[PDB]
Amino acid sequence: GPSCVMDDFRDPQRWKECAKQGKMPCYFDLIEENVYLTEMQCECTPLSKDERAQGEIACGEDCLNRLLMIECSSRCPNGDYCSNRRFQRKQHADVEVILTEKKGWGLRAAKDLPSNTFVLEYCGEVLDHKEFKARVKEYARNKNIHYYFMALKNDEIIDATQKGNCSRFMNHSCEPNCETQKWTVNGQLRVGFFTTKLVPSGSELTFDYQFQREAQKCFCGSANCRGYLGG
Ligand SMILES: Nc1ncnc2c1ncn2[C@@H]1O[C@H](C[C@@H](CC[C@H]([NH3+])C(=O)O)[NH2+]Cc2ccccc2)[C@@H](O)[C@H]1O
Ligand SMILES: [Zn+2]
Ligand SMILES: [Zn+2]
Ligand SMILES: [Zn+2]
C-alpha cells in the first residue's frame, strides 16, 4: 500500500514528515559512498562509433576487469562508452521501498530486471571486528528489532544501522532472487546486490542474509524455508 521511490529520501524535511504518518521508513543518514576510520588497467579493444550505434556492449562479458570483479576507471579503452563502471556511475536499477506484512520495509522491482543485473550498492559505516561487536551488544541493549550488518573483508564489517542507503531494506528469503557480489573500485572493495533471476516488475527483491548470533523467525513464505534467519 505505502511505497516511495529512491528520490523521496533526499529531502530530510519532507521524509521526517512522511515518517510521522508511516508512509516512509524511520529516518537515517543517506550516503552514496562508505564511511570509514582510515583506508591496473582494462584490456578490451575499443568499439567504433559504428559499433556504438547498434548498442553492442563496451567492456562486456569478455573483459579482464569485469571477470576479476574489478571496475574500469576513467582511462579505459572505451571511456564513456564503458559499461563496467556500474558502481561509480551509480547505474542502479529502478526500485521502490515498500511496506511488508511482517518484515518491516522491503524493496520491489519497479520494472522487469534481467538476470545478473546490478540492483544497488550496500553502503554504510565500515567497522573492524572489535567496533562491530561492541555495536552488536549496544544494539541488543537498545533492543533494535532490525540488523543491518555485513562482512566485506577480514576485519571490515559494513553497518548500515545509523548511516546507509536503500539497499538496507533488502529482506531475507530462503529462496532468494539476488546475491551479493564484492567488487574492487580504485582498489577499495565494494559490495552490491545483483539479481540471480528474471525478477518481474512489482516483485520483492530478496537475498540470502547470512549472519552470526534470539534467532529471528523467518516470514519469507517460500516453500523449503529454514524457518529462522542466520547460519
Ligand atoms: N524473511 C524475513 N522474516 C522476518 N524478518 C525479516 C525477514 N527479512 C528481513 N527481515 C527483517 O529485516 C531485518 C534486516 C533488514 C532490514 C529491513 C527491514 N525490512 C526494515 O524495515 O528495516 N536488513 C538486512 C540487510 C543487512 C545488510 C545488508 C542488506 C540488508 C531483520 O533483522 C528482520 O527484522
Ligand atoms: Zn574491458
Ligand atoms: Zn572498460
Ligand atoms: Zn524463510
Quote the CA–CA distance of 183 and 189 in Å, as a whole number: 5
Tell me the CA–centroid distance for residue 104 and ligand 1, in Å: 7
Task: Provide the grid cell at 141.
Answer: 541493549
Tell me the CA–centroid distance for residue 229 and ligand 1, in Å: 9
Tell me the CA–centroid distance for residue 171 and ligand 4, in Å: 10
User: Is 15 annotated as belonging to a binding site?
Assistant: no
Quote the CA–CA distance of 126 and 148 in Å, as a whole number: 12
- Radius of gyration of the CA atoms of the chain, in A: 19
Closest residue by Cα to residue 213 from 106, 144, 140, 130? 140
Task: Reduce the DSSP state of residue 166 to 3 states and report it.
Answer: helix
Point out which residues pair with 35 in neighbouring strands.
125
Output the CATH code of domain 1-231: 2.170.270.10
Beta strands in the chain (DSSP E): 3-5, 29-30, 95-99, 105-109, 118-121, 124-127, 149-153, 156-164, 171-172, 178-185, 188-195, 206-207
User: Is 218 annotated as belonging to a binding site?
Assistant: yes
Closest residue by Cα to residue 59 from 43, 35, 40, 74? 43
Residues with CB under 6 Å of ligand 1 are: 103-106, 122, 145-148, 150, 167-172, 209, 216, 218-220
Candidate of 172, 174, 212, 228 to mutate for ligand 1, largest count of ligand atoms within 8 Å of Cβ: 172
Beta strand 156-164 pairing with 206-207? unpaired
Quote the CA–CA distance of 166 and 90 in Å, as a whole number: 13
Number of Cα atoms under 13 Å in the Cβ half of residue 51:
12
Quote the CA–CA distance of 130 and 53 in Å, as a whole number: 52
Distances in Å between the Cα of 4 and the Cα atoms of 39, 100, 110 are 35, 13, 11
Point out which residues pair with 164 in neighbouring strands.
30, 124
Q: For residue 148, give the amino acid letter.
A: Y
CA-proximal residue: ligand 1, atom 32 (nearest): 146
CA-proximal residue: ligand 1, atom 10 (nearest): 103
Is 157 within 8 Å of 127 (Cβ atoms)? Answer: yes
Q: For residue 55, give the amino acid letter.
A: G
Quote the CA–CA distance of 79 and 218 in Å, as a whole number: 45
Beta strand 118-121 pairing with 188-195? antiparallel
Is 225 within 8 Å of 174 (Cβ atoms)? Answer: yes
Is 192 within 8 Å of 87 (Cβ atoms)? Answer: yes
DSSP output for 31-48: -SS-B-S------PPPP-
Distances in Å between the Cα of 126 and the Cα atoms of 27, 39, 68 are 20, 10, 23
Task: Provide the grid cell at 163.
Answer: 548511516
Which is the closest atom of ligand 1 to the Cα of 149?
Answer: 27
Number of Cα atoms under 13 Å in the Cβ half of residue 65:
26
Tell me the CA–centroid distance for residue 46 and ligand 1, in Å: 43
Where are the chain's structural domains? 1-231
